[PDB]
Design a protein around this nucleic acid. Structure first.
Lengths: 260, 119, 188, 155
RNA sequence: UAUCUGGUUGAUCCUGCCAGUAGUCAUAUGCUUGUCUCAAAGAUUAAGCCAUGCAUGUCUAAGUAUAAGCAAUUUAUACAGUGAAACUGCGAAUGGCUCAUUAAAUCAGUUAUCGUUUAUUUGAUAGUUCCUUUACUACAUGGUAUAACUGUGGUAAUUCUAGAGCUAAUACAUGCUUAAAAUCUCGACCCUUUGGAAGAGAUGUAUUUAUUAGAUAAAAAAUCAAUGUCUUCGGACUCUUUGAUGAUUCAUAAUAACUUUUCGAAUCGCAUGGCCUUGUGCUGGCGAUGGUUCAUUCAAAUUUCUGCCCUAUCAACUUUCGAUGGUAGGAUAGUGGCCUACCAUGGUUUCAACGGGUAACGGGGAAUAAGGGUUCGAUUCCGGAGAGGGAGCCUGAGAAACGGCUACC
RNA sequence: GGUCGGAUUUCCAACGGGGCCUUUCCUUCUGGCUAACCUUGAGUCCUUGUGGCUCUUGGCGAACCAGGACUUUUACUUUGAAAAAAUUAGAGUGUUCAAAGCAGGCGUAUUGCUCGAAUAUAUUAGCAUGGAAUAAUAGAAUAGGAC
RNA sequence: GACCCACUCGGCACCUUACGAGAAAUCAAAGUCUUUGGGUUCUGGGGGGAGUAUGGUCGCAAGGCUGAAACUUAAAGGAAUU
RNA sequence: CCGCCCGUCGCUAGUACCGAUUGAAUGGCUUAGUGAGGCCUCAGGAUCUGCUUAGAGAUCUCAGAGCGGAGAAUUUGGACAAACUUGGUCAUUUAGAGGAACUAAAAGUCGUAACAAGGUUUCCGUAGGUGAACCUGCGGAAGGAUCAU
RNA sequence: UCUAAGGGUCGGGUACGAUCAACUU
RNA sequence: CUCUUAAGGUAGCCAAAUGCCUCGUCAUCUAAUUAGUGACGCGCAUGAAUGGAUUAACGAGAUUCCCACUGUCCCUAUCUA
């Protein structure tokens, strides 16, 4: 005890980093940042383990100490910088703009995007308050404070951020008939067009969702994240589109898909 | 991250007869090898027992039973004529030992004995 | 030191708990100081997160509010007996929150005379305009108007001097004032 | 009830920062603060009309109900502004595939907005700690009597 | 792979145990031992503890370097390459080790903070401060010490240090420079009845207190204290400012003041450009560090519900100098008998209280089982503790710290 | 089997849901969409028996949610969320097999492509949800009873 | 009223049989129990030591209730058979 | 049936019990007393130092005196409280003359209590007595040697 | 040097006031 | 086994205020104990209303040990009337 932990062991790290456990030793502890420890992805993991551009932490550091890579238009030469959901990673090598999104199994899908799409990102407003001198502000999921927004931006709406100016271009309300990208939970990575909402004062508001295959399900509103209207997302979605083809369908695919 | 187990009665001459016959037929140095095949076969049998207790047209049954059947077929233990998840229970140590390589060398020729094949 | 903890007490069933942890600075308690009157003496104590607390010893002044009129004025404060609180940690005839005290009354007298043009007990165009405008209000109360004769006003301390370092308060008025002096039989 | 008349104690009991100016001759002479505790709990007329203070009350006081809401039967009324409720339940033992009756006693603060009697069922809500043992406050009552007083009148 | 066999009798059937049988990431030991892969390992007994001998500090283009150090920049006469030391700043509160104490207590899952702290990260965020606010001044940017260093010494000895002489700082202590407008009070003055005025002062942020606003489901008319913006001064009167929560005395704002008075860059590196009234003139980039508050993050502290082994040859415990609650205060980062003053007399218990024992840290889990279950869990994850025993405390965001101090044993 | 061991329509039937009517309220109050509509405006490239692709302005409140009202209380059960990671079971896969591991496979291997790292279980407590048998509980008898 | 016949409720029991049960002796309950579950209380877990020692509690006492361990042992025991 | 079998006494060995000894040892908890240390507080003021009229030719003294600021030793009171002493209490081990049991051995001594009607039918409870098994009384049972007038 | 507690007699326009005096803790 | 008595000393108790031998023997208490206590018992010569064994409370009863306390003592000296 006696102050905060600085280490993190292999087996304690979230399962969606995919490394190895039994006395494999240590894992990269995300530094404090915009995102939470578990719902985040450090750059060392994004670069050594997913993209295979590097093989070692010193290689990753050699990369990061050259202003090559930037998160949200800013360099972030920290090794264990917690990058998270809907975060834009930009490498001038290959001019590859990486959006961190979720695949359907719950891992961090490595989405490649256009520069015009990397221009912006999205943010779920967590609270709307008045600050000092009567100045209203909204707080997003990525710890971004934005002053003097549209007064119609109420809580759980989502917001389009221009990422160079921390300003708001357009907002999307929380209502029925709106797309959703589930963040957190069993049903993580699914995309399903809110059916309706269940209030439960003092009791964790629930949301009922319906995939394109009419596979209805239910999640928690803290885990819901809106992204657009029916059939008009605001982001390039990954390969899979959040459907969760069952294991049977998956084997039927990878047996009939391809004899390789 | 480790595994294996062995039998119950250390004697019972009928078993000794059967085991030594298999050992002589298939060129084995130990009873541990027969025990190993019986262990594998027991795992398979109890898996299939659970699945058969499950409902027909049940997703876990279909998935895991087809998988188990596919594995045994591609090994050649389960013939492709009997592919229904009951001969998986009817299997036997002879049917596994026949697919061992030593036995396959001999039956394919090329060694004129199972002991020569092992060597 | 002083453990501000419950693991040492007893169970609600009467069960004697075992000494279970060496004392923790989480559970920390400190020693008061007996905020008396006279010769301002304030010591700063470092607290959790830094966050200086200003332990007052022997204040002399305070800031007292007259709310029916809606002002606040600095005055000197006067006698005390308290508390009905303690035996262990604070000792001597202190000054604290919820204590009734006598205060100077002269800044309020001056303010009232200059703001209403009216005395208590017993000119220019702008001033006369203002007084005539905001008249029909200088009618406070028999009790307060009687206190001003002596020139010492009953007030209650609202600040916690051992935490903040001040002697802010409010002048008694109404049902409070009707209530209070049947009490204040205390030392320590 | 509670016969504090209103001011039984040696300090003056008032609601903090609730100021009744003797200057303004308001035609009520009754300035109180109450709140809707929330969760569809009805604020009683005894609390709105009363004279008590009770800083630990969820309607006129400073505490707030947040967390759990429980129910129980009053098995004691012998303290001042607090009761003890019985919370009975069945605990499953799987070895036997059966249940066993268990109780926990739970001390509760009760405002004088409620006339509470031994036997009455009472719904309580989680508050901040307000004593060594008390963490709950009465927020609703259901008397299991029907005012069955004349049934004792027999002749 | 839901299996049993030998033994009581002269013999039989039983009850019933003893014995055998199989396994054990359960230990020990004995005999034997060629190979490959994987590999636990002073836990049990002495939380005696290893009682020997060795180890956690750290720098960049970017806080301070006259090393009486190196090389040489040859771009330099103030430095401007590298760089020991030492000051400063961060860190040492993580990790690792062990299981002694611990039986509603840890702990597990599940809640809550509308009950609080939070260095760091991350994002936002200080025209308001010349206190006689027209000389009072340095704002092209003011003051002092001190280390390392030099040299004289003490002691047998230790990461002991004294006396004397220098010198620095995002050390310490101080301290100015940037609006405009509006609103308030005070108010010379001239005056009215409709009264209007020139000047002075205040209005950042933080602290403390008091007060106020922080609204709201809907429709027509009389009266008035003053008409009020504007008037057809008939009164058209509409226009209207009010966010969030299930819920607040919330967020926030405004009044009156309060403070021993906080913060509001006397900091640093590279690039050197633009404009003329060509002055070492005015403007100006990319960063670093630091900084108030808010929010976020890493957390912490408290907390709800339920749940733990054996014992009745422990049945009545608690309240004595707190047990249960109430009022008030103190203390605390905050809630709260946490602590006391006054008051009341409650609270737990055969649905096993309290007490005792544990060869008892808790769980995730392990072993063996047809199914149900029994036993184990010192551990390679999680969190509790502890550093020979006790207690106390400095520093700091964070320790009741022990590879940190203080004392007793 | 009308395309060449895979599929389709009306099908004789079975198994499970939903709605409505039978005296059957199987919660309503303030509302919108008023909707699934008397909205019908000339109406149709169909085996007249409806296997059924098609429009012109104006009806009933949940199919959409805003608030409210009161709302007998439980136990039980379904579904879902919660259920740290490793371990357990288990899918896939050349560790030379296996224990393991989460790797790796495919090309013209002449400057590339690509599948992945599933899933399930995890009693009890708590949360939400559908059911409403079984088992308790209350519901108008000196009527303070209902609309 | 007492007797006789038939019936009936409730009792003390009896004779016969085994559809069953049981190790058997025997049992209309000791049945409806491996085709294992109507409700509920008490007690036992090989034989000895030992119903002893000790502690409590009741009792005038005699004693009652509660009640071990060490140690020892492969049999003790129940029904039947010749 | 020349079968099985009971107890006393005596020898040997072992196990535990009682027991004078106000036994002993160890450990935990604790009353009372004494009470280190640091923390808070009332004081204290060695020393250093800014300014100021002061003693002295025009970032300075030469007697000194006030406004202060930092501030060590020491010190008052308080809470926290180690440790020690003295008692008490609980638990666990342990000695002990003697006493009284159990078990086992051993071809010991005295009888022969039970198993056949075991030669007085056995057993239960209670009470008394006797070398020992046991006997007797009172009531009860058949597990009787009688399912029967 | 203080504090607290412990009483008597009179009054109720059909919740409390005035007045008096002990010692004990 | 034998002699013998009216009966042969029972339950219990003991070197006891009862035991000669006797300072009995064993243990405990002490550095050391003819003392004390606890046990042993063919007890010169214990013993049952010439009452036996025991007993809380009581005792200016006899007795042993411990603590405290002391001029009892080591070892005496001084003061007052």
């Amino acid at each position: 005890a006696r102050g905060p932990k600085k280490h993190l062991k292999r087996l304690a790290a979230p399962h969606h980093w995919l490394l190895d456990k039994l006395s494999g030793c240590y894992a990269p502890r995300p530094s404090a940042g915009p995102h939470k420890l578990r719902e985040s992805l450090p750059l060392i993991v994004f670069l050594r383990n997913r993209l295979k551009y590097a093989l070692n932490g010193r290689e990753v550091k050699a990369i990061l100490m050259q202003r090559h890579v930037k998160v949200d238009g800013k360099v972030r030469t920290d090794t264990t910088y917690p990058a998270g959901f809907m975060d834009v990673i930009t490498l001038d090598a290959t001019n590859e703009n990486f959006r961190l999104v979720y695949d359907v199994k719950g891992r961090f899908a490595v989405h490649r995007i256009t520069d015009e799409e990397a221009s912006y990102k999205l943010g779920k407003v967590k609270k709307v308050q008045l600050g000092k001198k009567g100045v209203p502000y909204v707080v997003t999921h990525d710890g971004r404070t934005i002053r003097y927004p549209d007064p119609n931006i109420k809580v759980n709406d989502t917001v389009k951020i221009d990422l160079a100016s921390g300003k708001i271009t357009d907002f999307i309300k929380f209502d029925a008939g709106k797309l959703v990208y589930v963040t957190g939970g069993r049903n993580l990575g699914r995309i399903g067009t809110i059916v309706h909402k269940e209030r439960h004062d003092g009791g964790f508001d629930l949301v009922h969702i319906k995939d394109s295959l009419d596979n209805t399900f239910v999640t928690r509103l803290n885990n819901v994240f809106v992204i657009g209207e029916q059939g008009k997302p605001y982001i390039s979605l990954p390969k899979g589109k959040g459907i969760k083809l069952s294991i049977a369908e998956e084997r039927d695919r990878r047996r009939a898909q391809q004899g390789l | 991250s480790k595994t294996y187990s062995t039998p119950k009665r250390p004697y019972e001459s009928s078993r000794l007869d059967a085991e030594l016959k298999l050992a002589g037929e298939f060129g084995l140095k130990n009873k541990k090898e027969i025990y190993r095949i019986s262990f594998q076969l027991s795992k398979i049998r109890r898996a299939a027992r659970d699945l058969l207790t499950r409902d027909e047209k049940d997703p876990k049954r279909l998935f895991e039973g087809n998988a188990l059947i596919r594995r045994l077929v591609r090994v050649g233990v389960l013939s492709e004529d009997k592919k229904k998840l009951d001969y998986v229970l009817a299997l036997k140590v002879e049917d596994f030992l026949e697919r061992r390589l030593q036995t396959q060398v001999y039956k394919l020729g090329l060694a004129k004995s199972v002991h020569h094949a092992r060597v | 030191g002083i453990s501000r903890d419950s693991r040492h007490k007893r169970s609600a069933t009467g069960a004697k708990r075992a000494q279970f942890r060496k004392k923790r600075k989480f559970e920390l308690g400190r020693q008061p100081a007996n905020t008396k009157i006279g010769a301002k003496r304030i010591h700063s104590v470092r607290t959790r997160g830094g966050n200086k607390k200003y332990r007052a010893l022997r204040i002399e002044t305070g800031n007292f509010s007259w709310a029916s009129e809606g002002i606040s004025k600095k005055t000197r404060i006067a006698g005390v007996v308290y508390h009905p609180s303690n035996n262990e940690l604070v000792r001597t005839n202190t000054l604290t929150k919820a204590a009734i005290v006598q205060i100077d009354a002269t800044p309020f007298r001056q303010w009232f005379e200059a703001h209403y043009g009216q005395t208590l007990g017993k000119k220019s165009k702008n001033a006369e305009r203002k007084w005539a405008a905001r008249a029909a209000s200088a009618k406070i109360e028999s009790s307060v108007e009687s206190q001003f004769s002596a020139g010492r006003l009953y007030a209650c301390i609202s600040s916690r001097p051992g935490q903040s370092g001040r002697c802010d308060g409010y002048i008694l008025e109404g049902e409070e004032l009707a209530f209070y002096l049947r009490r204040l039989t205390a030392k320590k | 009830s509670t016969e504090l008349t209103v001011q039984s104690e040696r300090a003056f009991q008032k609601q903090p920062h609730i100021f009744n100016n003797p200057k303004v001759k308001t035609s009520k002479r009754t300035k109180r603060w109450y709140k809707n505790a929330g969760l569809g709990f009805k604020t009683p007329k005894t609390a709105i009309e009363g004279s008590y203070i009770d800083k630990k009350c969820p309607f006129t006081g400073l505490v707030s109900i947040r967390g759990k809401i429980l129910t129980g039967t009053v098995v004691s009324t012998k303290m001042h502004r607090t009761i003890v409720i019985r919370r009975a339940y069945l605990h499953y033992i799987p070895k036997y595939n059966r249940y066993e009756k268990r109780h926990k006693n739970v001390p509760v603060h009760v405002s004088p907005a409620f006339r509470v009697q031994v036997g009455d069922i009472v719904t309580v809500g989680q508050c901040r700690p307000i004593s060594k043992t008390v963490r709950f406050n009465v927020v609703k009552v259901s008397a299991a009597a029907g005012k069955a007083n004349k049934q004792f009148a027999k002749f």
